[PDB]
Design a protein around this ligand. Structure first.
Ligand code: FES
Lengths: 183, 178, 71, 174, 234, 26, 281
RNA sequence: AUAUAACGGAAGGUACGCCGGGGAAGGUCAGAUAAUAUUGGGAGUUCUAAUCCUCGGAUUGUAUCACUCCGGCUCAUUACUCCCUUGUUAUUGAACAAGAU
RNA sequence: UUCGUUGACUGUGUUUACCACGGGGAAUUAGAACAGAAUAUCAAGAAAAA
RNA sequence: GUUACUAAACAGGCCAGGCCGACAAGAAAAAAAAAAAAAAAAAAA
């Protein structure tokens, strides 16, 4: 037979309860639309003239300095791209096909019933893995709370990240059993 | 690429105009023996099947025969219980629209008797089926035997050389000339 | 057909070979504007199209229509 | 039991489409003249059809597209046709000119020609055009009499009646 | 090898194809690598070469020979490239030759010949031996054209499901100077020139997708409109 | 659908003249 | 498991206005054809499932994740992508003012934004992700480092650290990795596109020749055999001459007769443009 | 707003009938079909042609089926070696007799 | 952008493609003018020495 | 200069006569990405 992808409620019980709980839904919505101050009447102000003047000054300074700083990186990147394209053009026609395939290349999938190995990104090369301990030790209290909440919502979104790896067969069911289910 | 037994084209059950039979683009050439239509006509499926059965029976199980054309073109006829003018009639038979010069059947076995040019081809099955086809026919045999490989030419040259030698000896023996 | 490559060489800047239409185009100036008349091979033949283009060039030269308008 | 089609006699379609060009090359036209009649309805297996109706023409210089996709003129001029090799379609253009005698020596300007792009089509229209509006030209035997009368009065009026007086021609440059 | 010298006379300045035909000749046009030259060739002489088999129609050797036509003081070395001949009768209507020049590729379908079928073990055992490819495409650049390729079947034994003689076997027949070769598109190891198999044992295959039903072709050379219907089984 | 003009002739070249068949200017 | 006999998903039903039932609205012409205008499908008639946790709650979770990461990270990623696609050659440094003399712009994004009068509010609106495809794309490449780490971080639980503290030299690392890791070949789609197509690298003319050493002459010589010069030219440059016979049949002659001379359609379609790589000058 | 979708906008019988006007057993065609042979097949102890049945194609032909004002009696005319009668001694699966083509 | 808006306007001018006529109505022009009201979109921003 | 109109037969068949005050008119603007992977939300603006 032929199977179709599916995710049954039992294997994702956590997120369903998370989204069906009223209080958790309210908290998630407040996080999304934070702050929750009113914006309808004319008398609704969440700041003050002086406060937002100081904020504007700081923001302008930050943007000016960031643009002054990153411009050298941008120029270097432009030169590097020029060199890369020049090299690709210099390559012979035999090697052209391989030289344009991007890291994640893989031959097309066959539904049967220069590519030596699959692409795998070393997890030790991820920025947050390389510098996780230093950044964590340098975080603030609010940033730590933010990291905690980000973790918890990531887990809620993906309760089965490891389960899919372990038992991928649980997420594929036949057409004659999948198409016959109401929404 | 290997040998295969291709399935026959199917019968098209779609009403179509009587039309005309277009001419052949050119000569149709196939090695072996061929029975080739000489005038245009439409040959019925029953006629083609009868010819195939007769050819198989005559040639034997060990020999293979290829039916080159197939009856796929529908032809209609009215039932006797219908009045005139009430549309086209129901499909009645299927035909192959054979033009002149189209091969009906052929056997791809090449003649083995290259060194026996006086033994002209065996057209027994073709003769058996020809008087029953609604088309005049011609029997052909092409084996890719070219005159450059003819053995009769060598035979003739040898005979001529032998004759010349014989006359030379006779003249020398009688001794009437230097 | 078989043709020498020198056929497509033009002897004057105002005579051009246009290969999309396979025609000899002759440029000239009329009524303070630039125009081009084509001479097709499909019309005149291989050699005659070029010959007629050259004759038209000479005619325009006599008429004085090869001169650049000035404002 | 034969099902007689609805379009059998006497209830067949009275008026046929008549899809295609309605003005030939070198013909003189003015704004509003329908150069090509076309329809919006399209067949369900067009790419397999062979009749010339199904394959529409394309507007070019001084030509508009109508609601039903008719190609209509937008300026006083003479019709020209072009063949687009890239798209393999026919393109209808109008070279702007004032009314005057159509001479044998000027017929080459309205030949159907092959182009690869609409930019080249515009270039060819400029090159074959007779003159520009801002400079004009010396008209060769231009008409001098009033136009033909309205159709509802007479369908068979006479062109350039010598008995009628000369009237100024002040509409064919627009 | 198979080159033929022939004598021709002019196709004059107001005669037509039909006139030359009724005069007992065949009209021919030699072209490519020079001017287009018209001529007429005695029909008996030309049809002897075209239909050189007593019971056979147009011979594959005709479009593969090197003709050496002689007209006036000129000699045209060419090959027949277009032949209009009667479908039924052994009649030549019109011929178009293309010149052959040493140095430029000529695409010639050189025929194959099996004269030694009586020495074939498979044939003697009662199995069917077939010459699958009447001609082999070749690119010829030499001053001469290769003669027909002799396919030797004296060592062709039968083993199920079939035995085949392929192009790599014949590869040794090409000229030693490299003036001719098989078409590069040919896969010599899998292109089969001859088969030996048993009747009635072949596996079933579907009709090729490139099949065009000859019963639904109009007089213009186009498919009938019914061929595009959704219900057209072929 | 298009009617294609006949090019080769069967007999003599066609010639058109004004009026019905009669004795006329020669 | 990973290997499975996958079923081809049924096509999604594109809606239609309840009109024009007797006409073929699915011609294969390209928007916006002057003579073959395409019928629009109103967004209110496209069939869409009712909103549940599978399509709504997931969007809410991804939106909360984006809120935690900060819309500034998304804005920066979009800006970096847009500037990279347009600054692939050395530019002169650009200041945003005629007299600043000290301030630098930070990319040709400045030139593009000035030329298009792009909406400062519009960039924020885009970064706030009001659309289903935008949220779906953030769920897949939402990571700040995506140009170098692709979708590998799509499920990482410490991913927000990149958004919070990936700046300066680390941003430069991300860009330099992405430039080498990105695709540079021909894109093959039949769907409409309206933006500047991504670059496709030009291909060099000559191929590489294999050479092996020969001690008989103490020199390197080509591996391939000699062949006639005409055959070499045919193999290298192509068929030669303006006309040649078609390719010889590679299959055994069919036993049945078929009208192979007949073209596929009475009126062939127009020629297709060459979408492949161009040559190098 | 309105009915015109018959979309330039719905009772029947007459063999009691009447008036005006106009007329379908042929002539023609040849699908089945008839005659003659012929091809393939099946019968005939054995045997394709003593003889019988059937199929396809061919030529010829119109018994049956698909342009007027039934049957019998009386009188008939013409074609077909045709139902009996002829070819001693065609062929025969012809002893003879009675028969068959 | 998650962007406006209601020209899906009020009138003067008998000229125009098609053509039995009618329904300029398989669905033609800026009749390029004129008298009102409305909606959207401006342009410019040049010059960085030794 | 210039080749285009054109479905007659109780011929071989088609018909749903309808939608929209606007993500359906619509200024400006924007708009659909090879292979593979992740996700199993029918998703370009
Ligand atoms: S988001 Fe992947 S390493 Fe930073």
């Amino acid at each position: 037979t032929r199977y179709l992808p599916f995710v049954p409620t039992s294997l994702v019980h956590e997120t369903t309860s998370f989204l069906h709980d009223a209080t958790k839904l309210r908290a998630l919505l407040a996080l999304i639309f934070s702050p929750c101050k009113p914006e309808a009447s004319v008398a609704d102000e969440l700041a003050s003239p002086a406060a937002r003047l100081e904020f504007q000054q700081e923001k302008e300074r930050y943007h000016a300095i960031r643009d002054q700083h990153t411009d050298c990186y941008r120029r270097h990147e432009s030169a590097a791209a020029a060199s890369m394209w020049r090299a690709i053009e210099a390559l012979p026609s035999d090697l052209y096909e391989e030289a344009v395939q991007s890291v994640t290349f893989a031959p097309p999938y066959e539904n049967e019933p220069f590519y030596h190995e699959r692409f795998a990104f070393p997890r030790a090369l991820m920025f947050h893995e390389m510098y996780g301990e230093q950044i964590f030790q340098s975080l603030s209290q609010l940033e730590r709370r933010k990291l905690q909440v980000f973790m918890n919502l990531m887990h809620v979104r993906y309760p089965h990240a490891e389960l899919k790896r372990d038992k991928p067969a649980l997420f594929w069911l036949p057409e004659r059993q999948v198409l016959s289910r109401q929404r | 690429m290997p040998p295969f037994r291709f399935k026959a084209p199917q019968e098209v059950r779609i009403k179509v105009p009587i039309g005309r039979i277009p001419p052949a683009v050119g000569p149709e050439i196939r090695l072996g023996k061929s029975i080739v239509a000489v005038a245009p006509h439409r040959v019925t499926a029953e006629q083609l099947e009868d010819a195939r059965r007769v050819l198989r029976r005559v040639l034997g199980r060990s020999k293979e025969v290829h039916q080159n054309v197939h009856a796929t073109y529908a032809v209609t006829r009215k039932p006797e219980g219908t009045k005139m003018g009430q549309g086209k009639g129901s499909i009645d038979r299927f035909v192959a629209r054979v033009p002149a010069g189209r091969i009906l059947f052929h056997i791809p076995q090449i003649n083995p008797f290259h060194p026996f040019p006086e033994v002209e081809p065996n057209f027994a099955a073709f003769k058996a089926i020809a008087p029953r086809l609604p088309v005049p026919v011609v029997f052909r045999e092409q084996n890719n035997f070219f005159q450059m490989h003819s053995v009769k030419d060598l035979i003739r040259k040898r005979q001529a050389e032998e004759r010349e030698n014989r006359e030379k000896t006779a003249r020398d023996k009688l001794g009437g000339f230097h | 057909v078989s043709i020498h490559p020198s056929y497509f060489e033009s002897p004057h800047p105002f005579v051009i070979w246009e290969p999309l239409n396979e025609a000899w185009e002759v440029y000239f100036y009329e009524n303070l504007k630039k125009s081009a008349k084509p001479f097709p091979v499909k019309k005149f033949g291989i050699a005659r199209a070029k010959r007629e283009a050259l004759l038209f060039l000479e005619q325009m030269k006599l008429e004085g229509k090869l001169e650049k308008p000035t404002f | 039991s034969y099902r007689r089609p609805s379009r059998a006699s006497p209830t067949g379609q009275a008026r046929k489409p008549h899809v295609g060009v309605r003005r030939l090359a070198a013909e003189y036209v003015w704004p509003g003249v329908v150069l090509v009649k076309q329809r919006k309805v399209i067949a369900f297996n067009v790419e397999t059809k062979r009749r010339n109706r199904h394959f529409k023409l394309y507007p070019g210089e001084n030509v508009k597209v109508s609601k039903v996709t008719n190609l209509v003129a937008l300026c006083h001029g003479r019709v020209k046709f072009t063949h687009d090799v890239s798209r393999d379609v026919l393109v209808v253009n109008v070279l702007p000119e004032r009314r005057e005698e159509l001479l044998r020596e000027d017929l080459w300007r309205y030949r159907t020609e092959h182009v690869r792009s609409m930019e080249e089509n515009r270039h060819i229209c400029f090159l074959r055009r007779k003159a520009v509006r801002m400079f004009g030209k010396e008209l060769v035997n231009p008409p001098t009499k009033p136009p033909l009368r309205p159709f509802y009065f007479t369908k068979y009026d006479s062109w350039e009646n010598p008995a009628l007086p000369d009237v100024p021609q002040l509409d064919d440059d627009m | 090898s198979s080159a033929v010298d022939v004598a021709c006379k002019p196709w004059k300045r107001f005669v037509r194809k039909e006139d030359i035909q009724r005069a007992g000749y065949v009209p021919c046009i030699v072209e490519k690598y020079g001017i287009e030259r018209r001529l007429a060739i005695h029909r008996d002489t030309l049809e002897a070469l075209a239909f050189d088999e007593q019971h056979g129609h147009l011979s594959y050797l005709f479009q593969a020979r090197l003709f050496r036509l002689r007209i006036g003081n000129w000699i045209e070395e060419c090959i027949p490239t277009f032949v209009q001949a009667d479908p039924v009768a052994r009649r030549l209507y019109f011929v178009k030759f293309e010149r052959h020049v040493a140095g430029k590729i000529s695409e010639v379908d050189i025929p194959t010949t099996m004269v030694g079928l009586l020495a074939c073990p498979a044939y003697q055992r009662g199995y069917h031996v077939e010459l699958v490819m009447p001609t082999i495409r070749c690119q010829c650049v030499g001053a001469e054209i290769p003669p027909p390729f002799f396919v030797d079947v004296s060592r062709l034994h039968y083993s199920p499901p079939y035995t085949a003689i392929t192009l790599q076997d014949l590869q040794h027949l090409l000229p030693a100077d490299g003036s001719a070769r098989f078409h590069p598109s040919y896969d010599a190891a899998t292109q089969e020139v001859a088969w030996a198999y048993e009747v009635g044992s072949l596996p079933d295959a579907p009709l090729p997708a490139d099949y065009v039903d000859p019963n639904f072709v109009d007089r213009k050379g186009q498919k009938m409109d019914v061929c595009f219907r959704n219900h057209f089984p072929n | 659908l298009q009617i294609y003009p006949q090019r080769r002739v069967i007999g003599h070249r066609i010639e058109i003249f004004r009026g019905k068949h009669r004795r006329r200017r020669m | 498991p990973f290997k499975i006999f996958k079923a081809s998903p049924p096509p999604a039903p594109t809606g239609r206005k309840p009109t024009g039932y007797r006409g073929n609205h699915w011609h294969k012409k390209v928007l916006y054809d002057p003579v073959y205008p395409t019928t629009k499908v109103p967004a209110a008639l496209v069939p869409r499932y009712p909103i549940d946790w599978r399509n709504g709650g997931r969007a809410l979770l991804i939106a909360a994740l984006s809120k935690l990461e900060g819309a500034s990270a998304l804005q920066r990623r979009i800006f970096l992508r847009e500037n990279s696609r347009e600054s692939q050659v050395p530019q002169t440094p650009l200041s945003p003012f005629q007299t600043g003399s000290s301030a630098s712009g930070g990319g040709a994004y400045l030139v593009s934004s000035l030329g298009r009068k792009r909406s400062y509010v519009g960039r924020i609106a885009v970064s706030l992700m009001p659309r289903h495809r935008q949220i779906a794309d953030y769920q897949r490449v939402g990571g700040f480092c995506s140009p170098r780490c692709f979708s590998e971080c799509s499920k990482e639980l410490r991913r927000c650290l990149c958004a919070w503290r990936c700046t300066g030299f680390h941003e430069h690392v991300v860009q330099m990795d992405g430039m080498l890791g990105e695709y540079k070949g021909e894109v093959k789609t039949e769907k409409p596109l309206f933006s500047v197509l991504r670059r496709q690298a030009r291909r060099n003319a000559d191929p590489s020749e294999g050479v092996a050493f020969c001690a008989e002459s103490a020199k390197f010589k080509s591996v391939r055999r000699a062949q006639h010069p005409a055959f070499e030219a045919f193999d290298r440059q192509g068929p030669d001459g303006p006309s040649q016979k078609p390719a010889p049949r590679k299959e055994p002659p069919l036993p049945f007769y078929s009208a192979s001379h007949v073209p596929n359609v009475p009126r062939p379609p127009p020629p297709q443009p060459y979408t492949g790589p161009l040559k190098v000058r």
